[PDB]
Enzyme design. Sequence first.
Site, short mmCIF file in Angstrom:
data_model
loop_
_atom_site.label_atom_id
_atom_site.label_comp_id
_atom_site.label_asym_id
_atom_site.label_seq_id
_atom_site.Cartn_x
_atom_site.Cartn_y
_atom_site.Cartn_z
N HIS A 260 0.81 -1.21 0.04
CA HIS A 260 -0.03 0.05 0.15
C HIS A 260 0.90 1.48 0.03
O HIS A 260 2.27 1.32 0.38
CB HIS A 260 -0.94 -0.01 1.13
CG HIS A 260 -0.25 0.16 2.55
ND1 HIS A 260 0.38 -0.88 3.18
CD2 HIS A 260 0.02 1.14 3.39
CE1 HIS A 260 1.15 -0.60 4.37
NE2 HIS A 260 0.44 0.72 4.40
N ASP B 119 0.58 5.09 1.82
CA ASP B 119 -0.25 5.73 2.83
C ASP B 119 -1.02 6.50 2.39
O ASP B 119 -1.19 7.69 1.93
CB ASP B 119 1.01 6.60 3.66
CG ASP B 119 2.10 5.75 4.24
OD1 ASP B 119 2.64 4.86 3.45
OD2 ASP B 119 2.62 6.00 5.46
N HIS C 202 4.66 0.00 -0.19
CA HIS C 202 5.36 -0.65 1.00
C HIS C 202 4.53 -1.74 1.62
O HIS C 202 3.51 -1.75 1.32
CB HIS C 202 6.22 0.10 2.10
CG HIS C 202 5.28 1.10 2.94
ND1 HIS C 202 4.86 0.73 4.08
CD2 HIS C 202 4.51 2.21 2.57
CE1 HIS C 202 3.83 1.72 4.54
NE2 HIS C 202 3.99 2.43 3.80
N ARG D 114 6.18 6.79 13.71
CA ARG D 114 6.19 7.37 12.59
C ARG D 114 5.62 8.78 12.41
O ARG D 114 4.75 9.08 13.25
CB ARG D 114 5.13 6.55 11.47
CG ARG D 114 4.95 7.16 10.26
CD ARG D 114 4.14 6.00 9.34
NE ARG D 114 2.89 5.59 9.83
CZ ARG D 114 1.77 6.28 9.98
NH1 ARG D 114 1.67 7.52 9.89
NH2 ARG D 114 0.77 5.72 10.78
NA NA Z 1 1.82 2.25 5.80
#
Ligand code: NA
Lengths: 279, 270
Positions: B95, B97, B229, B246
């Site tokens: 996918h 983000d 990713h 993140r």
């Molecule tokens: Na992700």
Amino acid sequence: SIEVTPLSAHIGAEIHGVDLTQKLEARQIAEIRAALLKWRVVFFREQFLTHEQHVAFSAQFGELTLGHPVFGHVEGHPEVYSISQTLQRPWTGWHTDVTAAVNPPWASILRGVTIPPYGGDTQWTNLVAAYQKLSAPLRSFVDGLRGIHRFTPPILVTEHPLVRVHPETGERALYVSPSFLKSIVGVSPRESQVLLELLWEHVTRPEFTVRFKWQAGSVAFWDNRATAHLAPTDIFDLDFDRQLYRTTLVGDVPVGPDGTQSVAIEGSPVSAAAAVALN
Amino acid sequence: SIEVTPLSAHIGAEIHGVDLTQKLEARQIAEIRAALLKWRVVFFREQFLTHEQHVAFSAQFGELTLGVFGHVEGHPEVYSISKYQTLQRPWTGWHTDVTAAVNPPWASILRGVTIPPYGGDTQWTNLVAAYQKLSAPLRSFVDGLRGIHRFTPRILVTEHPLVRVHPETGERALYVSPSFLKSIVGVSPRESQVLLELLWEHVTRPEFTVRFKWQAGSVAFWDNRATAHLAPTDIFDLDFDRQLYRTTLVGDVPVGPDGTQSVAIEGSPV
Ligand code: NA
Ligand code: NA
């Protein structure tokens, strides 16, 4: 006592603490062998070997195959093989070495001499983990199936079990060597096609795999009874030279869960050595 | 001057010679940004950062997104990635983000704090290389297509171009975010299904990917305009804790080759 550093949940480990230019003690050999059986492929770093040292290391684990007069031939060393549009699917390029033969080699030892700064990674997948992750009805189904493996050198035909019982651990491997396995015995062409694509997609799932970035002096030692692997294609792209050398160890005839051995259907001894040298 | 060490033919590079606990000078920032645009994802090692330092490093490259989910006390910009039967295809889990939003974040910065000794690797794929390796008739075909991305946890629906023109490099990315892209606009359901599976099988070919084995203090910084990713699935398979954090950077509205911007259908922007 060697140092074993695993590289993923269930396949691949680095070994440190061994000098492969030297003859090894029996305990070191047994420890390396156990790590290989457990992790399916083991890796060494900073091992700068001669052809003689490479052969000497290999002979501590089995009998060396003796090569091909042309393909991969290294003068003076019959045991050493030189390594220097397609329809693209997830299993493209994935294979177990020489499964078109009735007795595929049980292991290979590949050393990197001239290695590009990047590009050229190799991958392996764990066929035992893949078998175990099939659902129970699928496992019972493939336990009873046989497959035809074929190779045509630049002709070998062998019937293998789809499930290979590992002769040292007793584990079952999903023995589906995607480059060479062509059909499932006793089912229709479409049934065979659908089932092979199901199993080939399954064995290439990332959870079963490990990727290795080579350096000069690196060595990969893998158990062909429990793995398939994928050669790089990104080298035919970049400017860098790449030179590796491989030895392989003579294996036995595979056996399936019901005890039935593999059966040779067609094949010349010359054609078999060409497969060892090229696969 | 930073040192860049590529990890594959066209995606992934390690960066050395930078101390991410400090404010970077403009030359270092520019060099990192160029390395990121060139290699799609860049990695740092032995960068043991506080949340505050993670945010400060991130702010040198853009505006931080402000996300209860993954909540980090005292830092609304930082998301906690903590360890605490699906239909398996080659593209499962891959996918880009938040592409269900009209303005997906253009980059993410993920740092590893509690890292298993083994297991838990992450992979990225190069969507620009993947676009370029489609045959010419396929490129021209997908240039004109639009796709519906959906996320339901609120509910987000957005129409994006299937080919995203990179706002800084002008490159074309095969913008096929497999977890979120649901259908191709204007074709039949079966046509959409077949074409998506074609493109999704294509973008996950190993020649387009790089794999990263984390260590404590590692950092991954990727360009969401050019990558997808894949998170690891071996996390509960092993008895190792795994903790990462993140940050993401506010992105702009994607544009296709014909200049058509993405269109919000349902939900609010990032
Ligand atoms: Na992700
Ligand atoms: Na091979």
